[PDB]
RNA sequence: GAGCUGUAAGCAAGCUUUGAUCCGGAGAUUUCCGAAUGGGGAAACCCACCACUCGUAAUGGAGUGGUAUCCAUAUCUGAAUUCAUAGGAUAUGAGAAGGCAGACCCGGGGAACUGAAACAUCUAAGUACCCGGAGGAAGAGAAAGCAAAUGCGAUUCCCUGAGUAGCGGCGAGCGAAACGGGAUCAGCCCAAACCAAGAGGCUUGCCUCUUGGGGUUGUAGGACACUC
RNA sequence: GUGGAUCCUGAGUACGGCGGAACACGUGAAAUUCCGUCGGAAUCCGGGAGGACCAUCUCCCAAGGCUAAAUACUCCCUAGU
RNA sequence: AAGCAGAAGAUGCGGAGCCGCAGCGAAAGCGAGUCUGAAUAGGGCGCAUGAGUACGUGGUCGUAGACCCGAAACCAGGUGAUCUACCCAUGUCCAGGGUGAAGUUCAGGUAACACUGAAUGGAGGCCCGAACCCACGCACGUUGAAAAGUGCGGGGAUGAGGUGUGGGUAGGGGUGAAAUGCCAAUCGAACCUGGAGAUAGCUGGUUCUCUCCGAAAUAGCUUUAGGGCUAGCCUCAAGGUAAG
RNA sequence: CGGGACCUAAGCCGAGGCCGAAAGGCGUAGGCGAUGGACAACAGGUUGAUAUUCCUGUACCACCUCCUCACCAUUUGAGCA
RNA sequence: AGGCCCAGGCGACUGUUUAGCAAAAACACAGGUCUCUGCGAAGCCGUAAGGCGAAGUAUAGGGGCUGACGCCUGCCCGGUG
RNA sequence: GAUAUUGAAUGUUGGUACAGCUUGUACAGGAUAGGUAGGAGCCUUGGAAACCGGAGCGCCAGCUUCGGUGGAGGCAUCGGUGGGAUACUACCCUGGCUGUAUUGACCUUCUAACCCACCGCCCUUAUCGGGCGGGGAGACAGUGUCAGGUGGGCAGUUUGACU
RNA sequence: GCACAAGGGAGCUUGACUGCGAGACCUACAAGUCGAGCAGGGACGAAAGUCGGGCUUAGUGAUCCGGUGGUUCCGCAUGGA
């Protein structure tokens, strides 16, 4: 589960609430399963939104 | 993102109506329908080239046409047609007769619609025939008719 | 260079000065399982297909080789769908899976007991553990750096700085850097701009697409013109 | 080596708001860096840093890549303590 | 010091670096003065009554497990449904006797089936009772034959039934006709290895001899009362020295 | 004869594939998996240990001709499934 | 190979349970009742796929309370859902 | 709930690039005076005076305007006012409106993406998925971020001493 | 303990001041209490002389962290902040 174009994957980190508790948390990626012609043909794979805007064609 | 429209958005925009078109919807619709094309350096340069080419073509087409057309139109042309007593002409030389005259005499090759004459000359004299050489420029043709035999 | 066919007594029988046993260098062979790879599998078990060979009058049977998956190149096919693709078939592939040493290291996850005489921030600690990769070392590395002087010039590691600054329920506790002195010593290529050739698109006289020539810097450098 | 007619010097990136992590640094005035979202620059007449920030000054050209040497370890081998 | 040459050494180079000789003030800063202060005033800290530095022995302290043994417990990674709980697929077992439903046929009988009586009937989480299963009342055993039994009697025994084989549910969990029950003789949170030599203001132990001196069980504080700091009491060394 | 060169349930494995920090989980095709289904031997003796396996008789199941035989057919053409 | 009778309490009954102290008045049971759910049901397992519900479709499936059969479940919606 | 995935309209309320212009008195006064320069002149059949309706303003003084009937004269330096003179160029935003394109938001209908646990074909002996073709909704939902409310379902803890 | 008023009253005033402070009590520590006297301005009083809170003992709790006013202070190169 990562963007095929760039190395964008699910990262991890803490979740500091009031009193600075240290509950563990995960950070996802805003990626969608849209059609892109990464190869000679379209494949409908995951791709990051940040990379989708003004980037590779759909 | 910016696009080079190929057809109407709110009216035919083949001239490249550069705009901002909601990149998502822009891509989806314009690409699925071919309504436009990406506004990159290559496509922009191609559009500019095609546009300047057609502009110069039209400019030349109008320039070459107006000049000699008017210059020659400033000449005198004459023909002959029988007439009766009392000046009652036996016929009338319409635009078709004048077109045939200019085609067989001077070889001007002007369309019968571009050169029109509704009054239907019935007089045995001289007359100036305006012409729609250009939507903004026009010239007259000094036509003449005289008795025959 | 004269005892030796082990530990291990032997009982028996044999090899050795044409040179044994023995020592070292390079080789042959290496049943089955095992990443195990033809299929299955209760590890060392069972069952096959295609070729060559043995044998029977035939089956039946037996010996050698090939027959997993992923990935790269190429060839033939190539449905919905008309071309075309997905997909299928074939040949090349010291390519690759697995542990290893209970160690060193790069990164992703990631605790609690404990201490604070309780305890939640904090400490424990990015420790243990788990995961993926290689090397003999790995990481880093030639300043968009330090530094504030008639200034040093890639990283790395050692002594100092220093338990000083600073951080901290300003608690417990945590903890530097640079200068300085040392061990070593090496700096280099690409993109960009421009130019030669060709290809496709006609961006129709313009555009990018590929190999090559090119140049790499902050006293700014390169292209361009020229001197070399 | 000479000139600044003209061109280039690494973009969805440097950074910014939001929620985190590591830098001795616990969000504190918090520089610098990495992260996941959105916004988004100049490009030499330019840009970054000097522990918030601004002007002068000083140093350097990031968003491309490689680099042995001094460094850590021993499962094992040879010799010796 | 690092480091260089040197037998893993001593030695030589290496003054990079640290401490003292000047202190005061938070700091600018001043300087045997300085700070405070309006102020030659007064007072705080110092000199004038200079001695520190580097090694080695010993006492003590702080960080490492830190005096030796001792937990219950916590986290991470793994093994377990061959016992037991439930579920799934497929087989197997229930000797004998009794009861007698619905229904069906016939007879009576009503205008008509309603209704009654005879014949077959063999349903039942039916009855009594073997194998099998569960243990409920009592005795023996409790260093037993057995880390949960035996002897007598007891309940169910054709439907919520017992049982063989194979398979699934693995702990911050599963299962449970539900008791805090079972999960390999361990379960209010299974077992193995690591963190880990966890921590323990708690108990126990702490190994040769002589000699000089010689206490306490008291005050304050304390998330503290069986703990800890200061003071009180003891000892060792150097000074004032005759103050007690 | 109990099982393998016969089939299959639960369940597991599982190309491709879908998911997910990694490790990995799910699952199509396909295949494993009897505790099921189909399958050809029975009756008398033998030794100290084996026996519906050895000996003595009668038999059965699957398959091929070196031969044997009768049938059809060699293209509305036998035969196989 | 049955001791029986009189009378009351508890539980409609048969069944299940604290292996290894308590077999019961405990649990469940058929029944009643309230509530949720219109089908990619709701609920549940799982980070997500993928699955149970269910090769079901409101007379069907889940959750709570009471437990056959005869009579009834009376008042209060101020407080909390 | 905001944002990316995720836009097209019909109307709609602000602001931009074009546009349309009007609001102005302390009194003195014939009055409604804001000034700074140019100022001895201007409109008049492309028509005075008067008349009436409507639009606007307002310190209710009144003015202006536009719609038009009626038609040959109105206005102005100069006479006086007071701090400052009335005809043409402008501004100070005191004052309200309409049109075109973007611009952002509000509330409306459509479809393009997104979905498919709806189908037909092929991949393919496949109830997985994935390409095509129809239909269903559709800027929704799902997904990643940020925030608010609920949350013993779950986790780490605390609950003093003298007596 | 106060009638020599510390208890009553009448006038003027704010010493209910600023820097200090020889030396003492109490105290494990922190802390608390008295204080003649010096200097700068004052009040009362002709003067002397008194006034650094109440006739005297309880009327109040630290550190850290925050807020307000004044500063010959410092301010990560320079000048500011």
Swiss-Prot record, chain A:
The record's section on InterPro entries has: Bacterial_rp_bL28, Ribosomal_bL28, Ribosomal_bL28/bL31-like_sf, Ribosomal_bL28_bact-type, Ribosomal_bL28_sf
Q: Which Gene Ontology biological process is one annotated for this entry?
A: translation
Domain of life, source organism = Bacteria
Q: Which GO terms describe its cellular component?
A: ribonucleoprotein complex; ribosome
Q: Which Pfam families match?
A: Ribosomal_L28
**HAMAP family in the record:** Ribosomal_bL28
Family as reported in the entry's similarity comment: Belongs to the bacterial ribosomal protein bL28 family.
Subunit structure as annotated in this protein's UniProt entry: Part of the 50S ribosomal subunit.
The name under which this protein is listed is Large ribosomal subunit protein bL28
Starting at the broadest rank, the lineage of the source organism is: Bacteria, Bacillati, Bacillota, Bacilli, Bacillales
The gene designation is rpmB
Curated annotation (Swiss-Prot), chain B:
SUPFAM superfamilies in the cross-refs: L9 N-domain-like (SSF55658), Ribosomal protein L9 C-domain (SSF55653)
UniProt keywords, alphabetically: Ribonucleoprotein, Ribosomal protein, RNA-binding, rRNA-binding
Single GO molecular-function term?
A: structural constituent of ribosome
Q: Which Pfam families match?
A: Ribosomal_L9_C, Ribosomal_L9_N
Q: Which domain of life is it from?
A: Bacteria
Give any Gene Ontology cellular component: cytosolic large ribosomal subunit
Gene Ontology biological process terms from the UniProt entry: translation
Functional summary from the UniProt entry? Binds to the 23S rRNA.
- Which family, according to the similarity comment? Belongs to the bacterial ribosomal protein bL9 family.
Q: Which NCBIfam families match?
A: L9
Q: How does it assemble?
A: Part of the 50S ribosomal subunit. In stalled/collided disomes (pairs of ribosomes where the leading ribosome is stalled and a second ribosome has collided with it), bL9 in the collided ribosome contacts bS6 and uL2, while it contacts only helices of the 16S rRNA in the stalled ribosome; the inter-ribosome bridge thus formed is different from that formed between normally translating ribosomes.
Q: Per its record, how is this protein called by name?
A: Large ribosomal subunit protein bL9
The organism is Bacillus subtilis (strain 168)
Lineage, top ranks: Bacteria, Bacillati, Bacillota, Bacilli, Bacillales
């Amino acid at each position: 589960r990562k963007c095929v174009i760039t190395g964008k994957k699910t990262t991890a980190g803490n979740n500091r609430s009031h009193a600075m508790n240290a509950s563990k948390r995960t950070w996802g990626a805003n990626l969608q399963k849209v059609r892109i012609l990464v190869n000679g043909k379209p494949k409908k794979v995951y791709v990051s939104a940040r990379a989708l805007k003004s980037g590779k064609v759909e | 993102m910016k696009v080079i429209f190929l057809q109407d958005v709110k009216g035919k925009g083949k001239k490249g109506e550069v705009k901002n078109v909601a990149d998502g919807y822009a891509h989806n619709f314009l690409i699925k329908k071919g309504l436009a094309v990406e506004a990159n350096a290559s496509n922009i340069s191609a559009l500019n080239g095609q546009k300047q080419k057609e502009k110069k073509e039209a400019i030349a087409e109008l320039e070459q046409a107006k000049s000699l057309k008017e210059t020659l139109e400033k000449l005198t042309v004459e023909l002959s047609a029988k007439s009766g007593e009392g000046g009652r002409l036996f016929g009338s030389v319409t635009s078709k007769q004048i077109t045939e005259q200019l085609q067989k005499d001077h070889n001007i090759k002007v369309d019968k619609r571009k050169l029109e004459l509704p009054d239907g000359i019935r007089a045995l004299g001289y007359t100036n025939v305006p012409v729609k050489l250009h939507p903004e420029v026009q010239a007259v043709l000094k036509v003449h008719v005289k008795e025959e035999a």
